[PDB]
Amino acid sequence: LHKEPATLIKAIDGDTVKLMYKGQPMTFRDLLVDTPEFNEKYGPEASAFTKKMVENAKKIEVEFDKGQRTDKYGRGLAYIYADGKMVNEALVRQGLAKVAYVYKGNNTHEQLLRKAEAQAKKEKLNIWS
Numbered sequence: 001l002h003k004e005p006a007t008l009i010k011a012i013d014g015d016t017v018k019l020m021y022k023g024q025p026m027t028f029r030d031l032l033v034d035t036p037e038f039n040e041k042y043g044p045e046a047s048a049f050t051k052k053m054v055e056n057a058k059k060i061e062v063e064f065d066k067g068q069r070t071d072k073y074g075r076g077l078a079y080i081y082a083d084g085k086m087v088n089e090a091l092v093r094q095g096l097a098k099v100a101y102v103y104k105g106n107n108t109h110e111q112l113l114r115k116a117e118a119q120a121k122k123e124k125l126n127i128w129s
């Protein structure tokens with residue numbers, strides 16, 4: 001896979017962010033994870049964690065997987081990086097997202113993220129507390 005440039009337009013919630021990609025505004029949904037909705041337990045914490053990560057980054061990048069790049073709602077589907085650190089993984093490692101929505105052929109980082117989730121669960125972090 002390849003990292004590509006993007007710029008932050010606006011934080012949205014734990015697993016979605018508005019980015020400018022190839023010069024066009026888009027909503028991106030993070031591959032392979034599910035954060036709680038803002039209205040649910042840990043939802044506010046997941047949103048604040050993603051907000052800080054993307055706002056503080058000097059460089060945002062997106063990395064598409066091998067399969068579909070947009071979902072049925074028109075959201076980009078990608079791994080999002082903030083100064084080289086994957087947001088998707090960092091949420092899972094902190095117990096602020098579960099590994100989820102693992103569709104065959106857009107799942108390159110699945111085992112990396114499942115290892116992060118095992119660690120968060122062993123630490124009883126957040127959703128796993």
Ligand SMILES: Cc1cn([C@H]2C[C@H](OP(=O)(O)O)[C@@H](COP(=O)(O)O)O2)c(=O)[nH]c1=O
Nearest residue numbers: 015029030031032033034071072077101103
């Ligand atoms: C993460 C992901 C979500 N989706 C769709 C499945 C879910 O459909 P439904 O809306 O019908 O439940 C929805 C979950 O997104 P949210 O967790 O953002 O609600 O997004 C994909 O199609 N591909 C993906 O890789």
Ligand SMILES: [Ca+2]
Nearest residue numbers: 034035036037
């Ligand atoms: Ca969600």
